[PDB]
Protein backbone atom coordinates (compact mmCIF):
# COMPACT_ATOMS: atom_id res chain seq x y z
CA UNK A 1 0.00 0.00 0.00
CA UNK A 2 0.96 3.67 -0.24
CA UNK A 3 2.03 4.09 3.41
CA UNK A 4 4.13 0.90 3.65
CA UNK A 5 2.64 -0.39 6.92
CA UNK A 6 -0.30 -2.76 6.22
CA UNK A 7 0.93 -5.87 4.35
CA UNK A 8 4.38 -4.25 4.40
CA UNK A 9 6.59 -3.78 7.48
CA UNK A 10 3.65 -5.17 9.48
CA UNK A 11 3.02 -8.52 7.71
CA UNK A 12 -0.62 -9.59 8.21
CA UNK A 13 -3.32 -8.45 10.64
CA UNK A 14 -4.53 -9.89 13.94
CA UNK A 15 -7.46 -12.28 14.21
CA UNK A 16 -7.05 -12.05 17.98
CA UNK A 17 -7.83 -8.31 18.15
CA UNK A 18 -11.61 -8.43 18.00
CA UNK A 19 -12.51 -5.07 19.57
CA UNK A 20 -11.01 -2.52 17.08
CA UNK A 21 -9.43 -1.68 13.68
CA UNK A 22 -5.96 -0.80 15.02
CA UNK A 23 -4.32 -1.58 18.33
CA UNK A 24 -1.58 -3.16 20.33
CA UNK A 25 -0.19 -6.46 21.46
CA UNK A 26 1.91 -6.38 24.63
CA UNK A 27 4.15 -9.05 26.15
CA UNK A 28 5.70 -8.83 29.66
CA UNK A 29 6.28 -10.85 32.89
CA UNK A 30 2.58 -10.75 33.86
CA UNK A 31 1.45 -12.07 30.46
CA UNK A 32 0.66 -11.15 26.85
CA UNK A 33 -2.60 -9.73 25.42
CA UNK A 34 -4.35 -7.60 22.77
CA UNK A 35 -5.86 -4.12 23.20
CA UNK A 36 -7.70 -1.99 20.61
CA UNK A 37 -6.63 1.68 20.32
CA UNK A 38 -9.98 3.44 20.58
CA UNK A 39 -8.97 7.02 19.63
CA UNK A 40 -7.64 6.03 16.18
CA UNK A 41 -10.32 3.38 15.54
CA UNK A 42 -13.10 5.87 16.37
CA UNK A 43 -11.53 8.61 14.19
CA UNK A 44 -11.28 6.18 11.30
CA UNK A 45 -14.82 4.93 11.80
CA UNK A 46 -15.88 8.60 11.84
CA UNK A 47 -14.15 9.30 8.50
CA UNK A 48 -15.33 6.17 6.69
CA UNK A 49 -18.89 6.67 8.02
CA UNK A 50 -18.76 10.27 6.70
CA UNK A 51 -17.39 9.01 3.37
CA UNK A 52 -20.18 6.46 2.94
CA UNK A 53 -22.93 8.87 4.02
CA UNK A 54 -21.71 11.58 1.57
CA UNK A 55 -21.59 9.21 -1.41
CA UNK A 56 -25.27 8.46 -0.63
CA UNK A 57 -26.44 11.91 0.73
CA UNK A 58 -25.09 14.10 -2.05
CA UNK A 59 -27.16 12.32 -4.72
CA UNK A 60 -30.05 14.65 -5.72
CA UNK A 61 -33.33 12.72 -6.15
CA UNK A 62 -36.26 14.23 -8.10
CA UNK A 63 -39.70 12.80 -9.02
CA UNK A 64 -39.68 11.42 -12.58
CA UNK A 65 -42.28 9.36 -14.47
CA UNK A 66 -40.70 7.38 -17.31
CA UNK A 67 -42.82 5.31 -19.73
CA UNK A 68 -43.34 4.77 -23.47
CA UNK A 69 -45.93 7.41 -24.47
CA UNK A 70 -45.19 7.69 -28.24
CA UNK A 71 -47.14 5.98 -31.02
CA UNK A 72 -46.12 4.24 -34.23
CA UNK A 73 -45.70 7.51 -36.17
CA UNK A 74 -43.59 9.11 -33.44
CA UNK A 75 -40.57 6.78 -33.75
CA UNK A 76 -38.21 9.76 -34.22
CA UNK A 77 -39.19 11.22 -30.76
CA UNK A 78 -39.16 7.69 -29.25
CA UNK A 79 -35.51 7.38 -30.50
CA UNK A 80 -34.66 10.85 -29.08
CA UNK A 81 -35.95 9.56 -25.75
CA UNK A 82 -33.95 6.30 -26.08
CA UNK A 83 -30.73 8.23 -26.81
CA UNK A 84 -31.45 10.36 -23.74
CA UNK A 85 -32.38 7.41 -21.46
CA UNK A 86 -29.44 5.25 -22.63
CA UNK A 87 -27.08 8.23 -22.42
CA UNK A 88 -27.78 8.92 -18.75
CA UNK A 89 -27.44 5.19 -17.93
CA UNK A 90 -24.00 5.15 -19.58
CA UNK A 91 -23.04 8.23 -17.50
CA UNK A 92 -24.36 6.98 -14.17
CA UNK A 93 -22.95 3.44 -14.77
CA UNK A 94 -19.45 4.74 -15.49
CA UNK A 95 -19.43 7.28 -12.61
CA UNK A 96 -20.77 4.82 -10.02
CA UNK A 97 -18.32 2.13 -11.11
CA UNK A 98 -15.25 4.42 -11.13
CA UNK A 99 -16.36 6.26 -7.94
CA UNK A 100 -16.46 2.92 -6.15
CA UNK A 101 -13.16 1.70 -7.65
CA UNK A 102 -11.39 4.99 -6.79
CA UNK A 103 -12.78 5.48 -3.25
CA UNK A 104 -12.02 1.81 -2.50
CA UNK A 105 -8.31 2.55 -3.15
CA UNK A 106 -8.42 5.65 -0.95
CA UNK A 107 -10.17 3.79 1.93
CA UNK A 108 -7.49 1.06 1.98
CA UNK A 109 -4.67 3.69 1.83
CA UNK A 110 -6.45 5.55 4.67
CA UNK A 111 -6.20 2.44 6.90
CA UNK A 112 -2.53 2.02 5.84
CA UNK A 113 -1.83 5.63 6.86
CA UNK A 114 -3.80 5.22 10.12
CA UNK A 115 -1.68 2.18 11.06
CA UNK A 116 1.59 3.92 10.09
CA UNK A 117 0.65 7.01 12.10
CA UNK A 118 -0.09 4.87 15.18
CA UNK A 119 3.28 3.13 14.88
CA UNK A 120 4.89 6.60 14.61
CA UNK A 121 2.90 7.69 17.71
CA UNK A 122 4.40 4.91 19.85
CA UNK A 123 7.83 5.40 18.19
CA UNK A 124 7.89 9.09 19.25
CA UNK A 125 6.82 8.22 22.85
CA UNK A 126 9.44 5.49 23.47
CA UNK A 127 12.43 7.20 21.74
CA UNK A 128 15.58 5.20 22.67
CA UNK A 129 13.95 3.58 25.75
CA UNK A 130 13.11 0.76 23.31
CA UNK A 131 14.72 -1.00 20.36
CA UNK A 132 12.80 -0.84 17.07
CA UNK A 133 12.54 -4.46 15.78
CA UNK A 134 11.26 -3.28 12.36
CA UNK A 135 8.28 -5.65 12.13
CA UNK A 136 5.96 -3.23 13.99
CA UNK A 137 7.21 -4.23 17.45
CA UNK A 138 9.32 -2.41 20.02
CA UNK A 139 11.68 -4.38 22.31
CA UNK A 140 11.86 -2.44 25.59
CA UNK A 141 15.26 -1.72 27.16
CA UNK A 142 13.50 -1.69 30.55
CA UNK A 143 10.92 -3.66 32.52
CA UNK A 144 7.43 -2.57 31.45
CA UNK A 145 4.56 -3.95 33.58
CA UNK A 146 0.88 -3.61 32.69
CA UNK A 147 0.49 -0.02 34.01
CA UNK A 148 3.50 0.98 31.84
CA UNK A 149 1.97 -0.66 28.74
CA UNK A 150 -1.30 1.20 29.47
CA UNK A 151 0.70 4.45 29.58
CA UNK A 152 2.04 3.72 26.06
CA UNK A 153 -1.44 2.82 24.83
CA UNK A 154 -3.05 6.04 26.22
CA UNK A 155 -0.22 8.44 25.28
CA UNK A 156 1.17 9.27 28.74
CA UNK A 157 4.39 7.18 28.73
CA UNK A 158 6.94 8.75 31.09
CA UNK A 159 10.28 8.62 29.21
CA UNK A 160 12.30 10.28 32.07
CA UNK A 161 11.22 7.68 34.67
CA UNK A 162 12.65 4.70 32.73
CA UNK A 163 15.39 6.69 30.88
CA UNK A 164 18.29 5.65 33.15
CA UNK A 165 17.35 1.95 33.46
CA UNK A 166 17.19 1.95 29.64
CA UNK A 167 20.61 3.45 28.90
CA UNK A 168 22.29 1.03 31.34
CA UNK A 169 20.77 -1.80 29.28
CA UNK A 170 21.93 -0.13 26.01
CA UNK A 171 25.46 0.46 27.39
CA UNK A 172 25.36 -3.24 28.43
CA UNK A 173 24.49 -4.42 24.89
CA UNK A 174 27.67 -2.61 23.70
CA UNK A 175 29.37 -5.70 25.22
CA UNK B 1 12.91 -8.25 26.79
CA UNK B 2 9.30 -7.01 27.11
CA UNK B 3 7.56 -5.96 23.86
CA UNK B 4 4.68 -3.86 22.52
CA UNK B 5 3.48 -4.20 18.92
CA UNK B 6 1.30 -2.09 16.67
CA UNK B 7 -1.08 -4.05 14.45
CA UNK B 8 -4.41 -4.04 12.71
CA UNK B 9 -7.72 -5.92 12.61
CA UNK B 10 -8.57 -9.20 10.91
CA UNK B 11 -11.65 -11.43 10.96
CA UNK B 12 -13.49 -14.23 9.09
CA UNK B 13 -15.00 -11.97 6.41
CA UNK B 14 -15.13 -13.17 2.80
CA UNK B 15 -16.57 -9.87 1.51
CA UNK B 16 -14.62 -8.79 -1.59
CA UNK B 17 -14.15 -5.37 -3.27
CA UNK B 18 -12.32 -3.95 -6.29
CA UNK B 19 -10.01 -0.94 -6.59
CA UNK B 20 -8.59 0.82 -9.69
CA UNK B 21 -5.42 -1.27 -9.26
CA UNK B 22 -6.74 -4.57 -7.86
CA UNK B 23 -9.72 -6.95 -8.06
CA UNK B 24 -11.21 -9.50 -5.62
CA UNK B 25 -9.63 -7.90 -2.54
CA UNK B 26 -11.04 -9.41 0.66
CA UNK B 27 -11.86 -6.87 3.36
CA UNK B 28 -12.89 -6.76 6.97
CA UNK B 29 -16.07 -4.75 6.32
CA UNK B 30 -17.90 -3.48 3.22
CA UNK B 31 -21.04 -1.56 2.25
CA UNK B 32 -23.45 -2.21 -0.65
CA UNK B 33 -24.66 0.98 -2.36
CA UNK B 34 -26.76 -0.70 -5.08
CA UNK B 35 -30.43 -1.53 -4.51
CA UNK B 36 -31.23 -4.89 -6.13
CA UNK B 37 -34.45 -5.85 -4.29
CA UNK B 38 -38.14 -5.18 -5.10
CA UNK B 39 -41.32 -6.45 -3.35
CA UNK B 40 -42.78 -7.76 -6.64
CA UNK B 41 -46.13 -5.91 -6.47
CA UNK B 42 -47.82 -2.59 -7.45
CA UNK B 43 -48.24 -0.16 -4.54
CA UNK B 44 -49.62 3.24 -3.66
CA UNK B 45 -47.35 6.10 -4.64
CA UNK B 46 -47.12 8.70 -1.83
CA UNK B 47 -50.41 7.55 -0.25
CA UNK B 48 -52.44 7.57 -3.49
CA UNK B 49 -53.57 4.29 -5.09
CA UNK B 50 -52.84 3.53 -8.76
CA UNK B 51 -55.60 3.08 -11.32
CA UNK B 52 -55.14 -0.53 -12.42
CA UNK B 53 -57.10 -1.45 -15.55
CA UNK B 54 -56.94 -5.24 -15.85
CA UNK B 55 -57.98 -6.12 -19.42
CA UNK B 56 -58.99 -2.58 -20.54
CA UNK B 57 -57.30 0.28 -22.31
CA UNK B 58 -57.83 3.86 -21.18
CA UNK B 59 -60.12 4.33 -24.21
CA UNK B 60 -62.25 1.31 -23.20
CA UNK B 61 -62.65 2.54 -19.62
CA UNK B 62 -63.43 6.15 -20.59
CA UNK B 63 -66.01 5.43 -23.31
CA UNK B 64 -67.48 2.50 -21.35
CA UNK B 65 -66.79 -0.62 -23.44
CA UNK B 66 -69.44 -3.03 -22.11
CA UNK B 67 -66.67 -5.58 -21.29
CA UNK B 68 -64.93 -2.92 -19.15
CA UNK B 69 -66.93 -3.23 -15.91
CA UNK B 70 -67.96 0.20 -14.53
CA UNK B 71 -65.06 0.90 -12.14
CA UNK B 72 -65.52 1.47 -8.39
CA UNK B 73 -65.29 5.12 -9.52
CA UNK B 74 -61.95 5.70 -7.77
CA UNK B 75 -61.99 9.48 -7.42
CA UNK B 76 -58.19 9.94 -7.48
CA UNK B 77 -55.02 8.03 -8.45
CA UNK B 78 -51.22 8.55 -8.72
CA UNK B 79 -50.42 6.58 -11.92
CA UNK B 80 -52.14 4.24 -14.38
CA UNK B 81 -51.33 0.59 -15.00
CA UNK B 82 -52.38 -0.83 -18.37
CA UNK B 83 -51.62 -4.42 -19.44
CA UNK B 84 -49.21 -4.68 -22.39
CA UNK B 85 -51.93 -5.67 -24.91
CA UNK B 86 -55.33 -4.92 -23.31
CA UNK B 87 -58.04 -7.21 -24.74
CA UNK B 88 -60.82 -4.61 -24.40
CA UNK B 89 -59.91 -1.40 -26.26
CA UNK B 90 -62.47 -0.24 -28.86
CA UNK B 91 -65.00 -3.05 -29.35
CA UNK B 92 -66.37 -1.22 -32.39
CA UNK B 93 -63.23 -0.55 -34.48
CA UNK B 94 -61.91 2.99 -34.98
CA UNK B 95 -59.57 5.65 -33.68
CA UNK B 96 -59.25 7.90 -30.64
CA UNK B 97 -58.09 11.41 -31.62
CA UNK B 98 -55.07 12.74 -29.61
CA UNK B 99 -55.17 9.53 -27.48
CA UNK B 100 -51.57 9.53 -26.27
CA UNK B 101 -51.87 13.13 -24.96
CA UNK B 102 -55.20 12.39 -23.18
CA UNK B 103 -53.57 9.34 -21.62
CA UNK B 104 -50.72 11.59 -20.37
CA UNK B 105 -53.30 14.03 -19.02
CA UNK B 106 -55.09 11.19 -17.20
CA UNK B 107 -51.81 9.69 -15.88
CA UNK B 108 -52.34 11.45 -12.51
CA UNK C 1 -51.66 -6.71 -9.52
CA UNK C 2 -52.20 -4.39 -6.54
CA UNK C 3 -50.71 -5.58 -3.20
CA UNK C 4 -51.69 -2.99 -0.53
CA UNK C 5 -48.27 -1.39 0.00
CA UNK C 6 -46.82 2.13 -0.39
CA UNK C 7 -43.58 3.38 -2.02
CA UNK C 8 -41.80 6.49 -3.19
CA UNK C 9 -40.53 4.56 -6.25
CA UNK C 10 -42.47 2.07 -8.42
CA UNK C 11 -41.16 -0.41 -10.98
CA UNK C 12 -43.11 -2.55 -13.53
CA UNK C 13 -41.54 -5.58 -11.81
CA UNK C 14 -42.40 -4.27 -8.30
CA UNK C 15 -41.75 -1.47 -5.80
CA UNK C 16 -38.37 -0.14 -4.54
CA UNK C 17 -38.64 1.08 -0.97
CA UNK C 18 -35.04 2.19 -0.37
CA UNK C 19 -32.65 5.11 0.06
CA UNK C 20 -29.56 3.87 -1.83
CA UNK C 21 -28.24 6.06 -4.66
CA UNK C 22 -28.26 3.43 -7.45
CA UNK C 23 -30.49 0.48 -8.50
CA UNK C 24 -30.34 -2.10 -11.33
CA UNK C 25 -33.96 -3.33 -11.39
CA UNK C 26 -35.95 -1.68 -14.24
CA UNK C 27 -35.60 1.65 -16.11
CA UNK C 28 -39.35 2.42 -16.53
CA UNK C 29 -39.86 3.67 -12.97
CA UNK C 30 -42.29 6.23 -11.49
CA UNK C 31 -41.41 8.10 -8.27
CA UNK C 32 -38.50 9.48 -6.28
CA UNK C 33 -36.18 6.70 -7.45
CA UNK C 34 -32.49 5.74 -7.20
CA UNK C 35 -30.33 6.30 -10.26
CA UNK C 36 -30.55 3.38 -12.70
CA UNK C 37 -27.33 1.59 -13.63
CA UNK C 38 -26.26 -1.46 -15.57
CA UNK C 39 -24.41 -2.89 -12.60
CA UNK C 40 -24.56 -6.15 -10.63
CA UNK C 41 -22.40 -5.04 -7.72
CA UNK C 42 -21.41 -1.62 -6.35
CA UNK C 43 -19.62 -2.33 -3.04
CA UNK C 44 -17.67 0.21 -1.01
CA UNK C 45 -14.78 -0.93 1.15
CA UNK C 46 -15.10 0.29 4.74
CA UNK C 47 -12.69 -2.03 6.66
CA UNK C 48 -9.12 -3.02 5.80
CA UNK C 49 -7.43 -5.67 3.64
CA UNK C 50 -8.21 -9.01 5.34
CA UNK C 51 -5.61 -11.62 6.38
CA UNK C 52 -4.03 -13.76 5.23
Amino acid at each position, epitope marked *: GLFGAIAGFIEGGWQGMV*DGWYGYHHSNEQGSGYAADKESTQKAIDGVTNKVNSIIDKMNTQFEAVGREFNNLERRIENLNKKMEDGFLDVWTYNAELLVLMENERTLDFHDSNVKNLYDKVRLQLRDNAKELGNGCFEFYHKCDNECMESVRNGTYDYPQYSEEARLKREEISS | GDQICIGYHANNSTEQVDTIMEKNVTVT*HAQDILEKKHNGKLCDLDGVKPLILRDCSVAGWLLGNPMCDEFINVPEWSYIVEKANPVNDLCYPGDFNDYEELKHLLSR | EYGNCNTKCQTPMGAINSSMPFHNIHPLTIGECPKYVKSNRLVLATGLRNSP
Partner: antibody, heavy 130, light 113 residues
Protein backbone atom coordinates in the same frame (compact mmCIF):
# COMPACT_ATOMS: atom_id res chain seq x y z
CA UNK D 1 -20.75 13.52 33.63
CA UNK D 2 -22.48 13.10 30.29
CA UNK D 3 -25.97 14.57 30.54
CA UNK D 4 -28.96 16.13 28.74
CA UNK D 5 -30.74 19.00 30.51
CA UNK D 6 -33.94 20.31 28.87
CA UNK D 7 -35.61 23.70 29.37
CA UNK D 8 -38.23 24.53 32.03
CA UNK D 9 -41.99 24.02 31.62
CA UNK D 10 -44.00 26.14 29.21
CA UNK D 11 -47.59 27.25 29.60
CA UNK D 12 -48.85 28.35 26.19
CA UNK D 13 -52.19 29.43 24.68
CA UNK D 14 -53.84 27.76 21.65
CA UNK D 15 -52.37 29.10 18.38
CA UNK D 16 -49.13 30.12 20.10
CA UNK D 17 -45.77 28.40 19.60
CA UNK D 18 -43.08 26.93 21.92
CA UNK D 19 -39.33 26.24 21.60
CA UNK D 20 -37.99 23.54 23.94
CA UNK D 21 -34.19 23.34 24.35
CA UNK D 22 -31.92 20.43 25.26
CA UNK D 23 -28.35 21.13 26.39
CA UNK D 24 -25.74 18.42 26.04
CA UNK D 25 -22.74 18.41 28.39
CA UNK D 26 -19.92 15.97 29.21
CA UNK D 27 -19.71 14.31 25.76
CA UNK D 28 -18.83 15.27 22.18
CA UNK D 29 -21.99 16.95 20.89
CA UNK D 30 -21.06 16.42 17.18
CA UNK D 31 -20.64 12.66 17.70
CA UNK D 32 -24.43 12.26 18.16
CA UNK D 33 -27.92 12.76 16.74
CA UNK D 34 -31.14 13.62 18.66
CA UNK D 35 -34.68 12.28 18.38
CA UNK D 36 -37.53 14.20 19.97
CA UNK D 37 -40.15 12.00 21.64
CA UNK D 38 -43.34 13.04 23.41
CA UNK D 39 -45.52 11.54 26.11
CA UNK D 40 -49.07 12.89 26.26
CA UNK D 41 -51.06 12.30 29.53
CA UNK D 42 -51.99 8.58 29.65
CA UNK D 43 -50.45 7.97 26.20
CA UNK D 44 -47.37 6.00 25.16
CA UNK D 45 -44.24 7.47 23.60
CA UNK D 46 -44.51 9.08 20.15
CA UNK D 47 -41.52 9.89 17.87
CA UNK D 48 -41.55 13.45 16.49
CA UNK D 49 -38.35 13.65 14.40
CA UNK D 50 -34.54 13.54 14.50
CA UNK D 51 -31.61 15.92 13.97
CA UNK D 52 -27.87 15.26 13.54
CA UNK D 53 -25.51 17.41 15.59
CA UNK D 54 -22.76 16.61 13.05
CA UNK D 55 -24.68 17.39 9.89
CA UNK D 56 -27.76 19.50 10.88
CA UNK D 57 -29.68 16.92 8.81
CA UNK D 58 -33.33 16.33 9.78
CA UNK D 59 -35.84 13.51 9.57
CA UNK D 60 -39.55 14.01 10.34
CA UNK D 61 -42.69 12.20 11.49
CA UNK D 62 -45.82 12.30 9.30
CA UNK D 63 -47.95 13.88 12.07
CA UNK D 64 -45.52 16.75 12.94
CA UNK D 65 -43.84 17.26 9.48
CA UNK D 66 -45.44 20.72 9.07
CA UNK D 67 -45.73 22.38 12.53
CA UNK D 68 -42.38 21.26 14.05
CA UNK D 69 -38.83 22.55 13.31
CA UNK D 70 -35.61 21.21 14.81
CA UNK D 71 -32.33 23.03 14.90
CA UNK D 72 -28.94 22.99 16.54
CA UNK D 73 -26.41 25.39 18.07
CA UNK D 74 -23.02 23.68 18.12
CA UNK D 75 -21.50 26.59 20.14
CA UNK D 76 -23.83 25.92 23.13
CA UNK D 77 -24.04 22.14 22.35
CA UNK D 78 -27.81 22.65 22.37
CA UNK D 79 -30.57 20.99 20.32
CA UNK D 80 -33.97 22.73 19.88
CA UNK D 81 -37.51 21.81 18.83
CA UNK D 82 -40.09 24.47 17.80
CA UNK D 83 -43.82 23.66 17.45
CA UNK D 84 -46.07 26.09 15.54
CA UNK D 85 -49.84 26.33 16.03
CA UNK D 86 -50.32 24.80 19.46
CA UNK D 87 -53.40 22.65 20.14
CA UNK D 88 -54.86 21.06 23.26
CA UNK D 89 -53.73 17.57 22.06
CA UNK D 90 -50.19 19.02 22.32
CA UNK D 91 -50.37 19.02 26.16
CA UNK D 92 -47.55 16.57 26.79
CA UNK D 93 -44.03 15.95 28.10
CA UNK D 94 -41.38 16.43 25.42
CA UNK D 95 -38.19 14.39 25.77
CA UNK D 96 -34.89 14.88 23.95
CA UNK D 97 -33.25 11.48 23.36
CA UNK D 98 -29.64 10.88 22.26
CA UNK D 99 -29.24 8.78 19.12
CA UNK D 100 -27.08 8.12 15.98
CA UNK D 101 -25.33 11.09 14.17
CA UNK D 102 -26.03 9.69 10.73
CA UNK D 103 -28.66 7.58 8.96
CA UNK D 104 -26.01 5.09 7.74
CA UNK D 105 -24.07 3.73 10.71
CA UNK D 106 -20.97 1.50 10.73
CA UNK D 107 -21.48 -0.10 14.15
CA UNK D 108 -18.62 -2.54 13.67
CA UNK D 109 -17.46 -2.43 17.33
CA UNK D 110 -19.71 -2.19 20.32
CA UNK D 111 -18.03 0.62 22.34
CA UNK D 112 -18.21 3.13 19.43
CA UNK D 113 -20.06 6.41 19.95
CA UNK D 114 -23.54 5.40 18.84
CA UNK D 115 -26.26 3.40 20.65
CA UNK D 116 -29.71 4.91 20.06
CA UNK D 117 -31.84 6.18 22.98
CA UNK D 118 -29.02 5.57 25.46
CA UNK D 119 -29.34 9.01 27.09
CA UNK D 120 -32.51 11.01 27.79
CA UNK D 121 -33.33 14.50 29.02
CA UNK D 122 -35.46 15.02 32.16
CA UNK D 123 -38.31 16.20 29.89
CA UNK D 124 -40.12 19.49 29.30
CA UNK D 125 -43.84 19.81 30.05
CA UNK D 126 -45.70 22.04 27.58
CA UNK D 127 -49.25 22.82 28.73
CA UNK D 128 -51.62 24.22 26.04
CA UNK D 129 -54.63 25.85 27.68
CA UNK D 130 -56.42 29.21 27.28
CA UNK E 1 -43.08 2.54 7.99
CA UNK E 2 -42.06 -0.20 10.39
CA UNK E 3 -44.86 -1.20 12.76
CA UNK E 4 -43.87 -2.65 16.16
CA UNK E 5 -46.64 -4.80 17.70
CA UNK E 6 -45.98 -5.10 21.46
CA UNK E 7 -47.86 -7.70 23.53
CA UNK E 8 -49.28 -7.85 26.08
CA UNK E 9 -50.38 -4.28 26.96
CA UNK E 10 -50.70 -5.28 30.62
CA UNK E 11 -48.33 -7.57 32.54
CA UNK E 12 -49.22 -8.38 36.19
CA UNK E 13 -46.30 -10.42 37.61
CA UNK E 14 -45.88 -11.85 41.16
CA UNK E 15 -42.73 -10.66 43.00
CA UNK E 16 -39.92 -13.12 42.20
CA UNK E 17 -41.64 -14.61 39.11
CA UNK E 18 -40.67 -13.91 35.47
CA UNK E 19 -42.21 -11.51 32.97
CA UNK E 20 -41.95 -11.94 29.21
CA UNK E 21 -42.71 -9.08 26.79
CA UNK E 22 -43.12 -9.65 23.07
CA UNK E 23 -42.38 -7.33 20.12
CA UNK E 24 -43.15 -8.23 16.47
CA UNK E 25 -42.02 -6.01 13.59
CA UNK E 26 -43.93 -5.71 10.30
CA UNK E 27 -40.61 -5.97 8.52
CA UNK E 28 -36.88 -6.93 8.77
CA UNK E 29 -34.79 -4.51 10.92
CA UNK E 30 -31.31 -5.45 9.69
CA UNK E 31 -29.38 -2.21 9.12
CA UNK E 32 -26.90 -1.82 6.23
CA UNK E 33 -24.05 -2.81 8.65
CA UNK E 34 -25.42 -6.22 9.68
CA UNK E 35 -26.60 -4.92 13.07
CA UNK E 36 -30.30 -5.12 14.02
CA UNK E 37 -31.00 -1.93 16.02
CA UNK E 38 -33.98 -3.33 18.00
CA UNK E 39 -33.84 -1.87 21.55
CA UNK E 40 -35.87 -2.06 24.80
CA UNK E 41 -36.39 1.04 26.99
CA UNK E 42 -38.08 1.25 30.42
CA UNK E 43 -39.92 4.22 31.97
CA UNK E 44 -40.71 4.39 35.69
CA UNK E 45 -43.61 6.67 36.58
CA UNK E 46 -42.30 10.23 36.93
CA UNK E 47 -38.92 9.64 35.26
CA UNK E 48 -37.28 9.67 31.83
CA UNK E 49 -36.94 6.37 29.96
CA UNK E 50 -33.69 4.42 30.43
CA UNK E 51 -32.12 2.00 27.94
CA UNK E 52 -32.23 -1.68 28.97
CA UNK E 53 -31.23 -3.70 25.87
CA UNK E 54 -29.65 -2.68 22.56
CA UNK E 55 -28.90 -4.75 19.42
CA UNK E 56 -31.58 -7.36 20.24
CA UNK E 57 -29.70 -8.90 23.17
CA UNK E 58 -26.95 -6.61 24.63
CA UNK E 59 -27.28 -5.27 28.21
CA UNK E 60 -26.69 -1.54 28.61
CA UNK E 61 -24.26 -0.58 31.40
CA UNK E 62 -25.84 -0.95 34.85
CA UNK E 63 -28.50 -3.41 33.70
CA UNK E 64 -28.70 -6.68 35.79
CA UNK E 65 -28.22 -10.04 34.05
CA UNK E 66 -31.78 -10.95 35.21
CA UNK E 67 -32.92 -8.51 32.42
CA UNK E 68 -32.49 -10.34 29.12
CA UNK E 69 -33.14 -9.75 25.39
CA UNK E 70 -33.54 -12.25 22.54
CA UNK E 71 -34.83 -12.76 19.02
CA UNK E 72 -34.12 -12.59 15.32
CA UNK E 73 -35.79 -11.35 12.14
CA UNK E 74 -39.22 -10.00 13.12
CA UNK E 75 -39.95 -11.57 16.59
CA UNK E 76 -38.16 -10.18 19.66
CA UNK E 77 -38.57 -10.95 23.37
CA UNK E 78 -37.59 -9.09 26.57
CA UNK E 79 -37.73 -11.24 29.73
CA UNK E 80 -37.29 -9.99 33.33
CA UNK E 81 -36.48 -13.06 35.35
CA UNK E 82 -37.15 -12.16 39.01
CA UNK E 83 -39.28 -9.09 39.29
CA UNK E 84 -39.10 -6.38 41.95
CA UNK E 85 -41.00 -3.17 42.70
CA UNK E 86 -38.33 -1.11 40.85
CA UNK E 87 -39.20 -3.07 37.70
CA UNK E 88 -42.74 -1.49 37.57
CA UNK E 89 -43.41 1.02 34.82
CA UNK E 90 -43.78 1.09 31.04
CA UNK E 91 -41.63 -0.99 28.65
CA UNK E 92 -41.22 -0.07 24.98
CA UNK E 93 -39.45 -1.94 22.18
CA UNK E 94 -37.89 0.55 19.79
CA UNK E 95 -36.05 0.40 16.41
CA UNK E 96 -33.38 2.74 15.05
CA UNK E 97 -32.17 0.87 11.99
CA UNK E 98 -34.48 2.90 9.78
CA UNK E 99 -36.48 6.15 9.51
CA UNK E 100 -38.99 7.09 10.65
CA UNK E 101 -38.11 5.76 14.12
CA UNK E 102 -40.78 3.56 15.78
CA UNK E 103 -41.86 2.61 19.30
CA UNK E 104 -44.24 -0.13 20.45
CA UNK E 105 -47.58 0.71 22.11
CA UNK E 106 -46.04 -0.02 25.50
CA UNK E 107 -46.31 -2.71 28.17
CA UNK E 108 -47.22 -1.75 31.74
CA UNK E 109 -45.56 -3.99 34.33
CA UNK E 110 -47.26 -4.22 37.70
CA UNK E 111 -46.78 -6.36 40.85
CA UNK E 112 -49.44 -9.09 41.19
CA UNK E 113 -50.23 -9.63 44.88
Amino acid sequence: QAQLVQSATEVKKPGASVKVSCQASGFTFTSYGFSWVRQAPGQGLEWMGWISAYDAKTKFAEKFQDRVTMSIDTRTTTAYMEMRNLRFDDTAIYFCAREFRTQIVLGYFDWLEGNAFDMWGQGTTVIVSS
Amino acid sequence: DVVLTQTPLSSPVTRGQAASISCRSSQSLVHSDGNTYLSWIHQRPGQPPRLLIYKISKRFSGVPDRISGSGAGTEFTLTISRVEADDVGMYYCTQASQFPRTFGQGTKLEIKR
